């Protein structure tokens with residue numbers, strides 16, 4: 001039993017809700033919140049910009065030190081950093097950004113990072129400003145993640161479409 005509330009159950013392990021991931025994380029304080037990161041951990045817009053703003057830019061400061069030490073992530077890769085005031089940990093995951101011409105096949109590799117954590121609050125990878133089809137992202141999530149994932153979907157029209165189209 002966990003403290004996630006109001007989710008629709010899609011499979012044994014995948015749940016979904018129309019919610020602002022920032023407001024969700026503040027309420028639940030999950031062990032892991034997933035950020036929709038880029039390889040530079042430049043948290044400018046989308047989920048990343050929103051999460052960073054909620055940390056008063058502390059996420060960006062920590063991220064800049066991470067990059068200075070380690071260099072950029074790989075597309076499809078991840079790193080674990082602090083969750084600041086939002087969660088214990090933030091798993092920064094880089095899905096392919098279609099608006100940069102990145103291979104959508106790397107979306108499965110991106111979701112594989114979730115399997116290293118028993119429970120996660122997450123957005124749909126490569127959705128939103130990353131340009132991929134969110135219905136496809138949900139399908140890859142369900143077919144790749146085996147741990148317990150609570151998906152927050154920002155856009156209401158998208159949430160209803162994802163549920164009503166889910167197979």
Ligand SMILES: OC[C@H](Cc1cccs1)Nc1ncnc2[nH]ccc12
Pocket residue numbers: 019020021022036046047050123124125126127128129152153154155158
């Ligand atoms: O798949 C990630 C989605 C993409 C979108 C499609 C339409 C509108 S946003 N973004 C988010 N999902 C959940 N919480 C969020 N908080 C801020 C942004 C955000």
Ligand SMILES: [Cl-]
Pocket residue numbers: 045046047127128129130
């Ligand atoms: Cl977005």
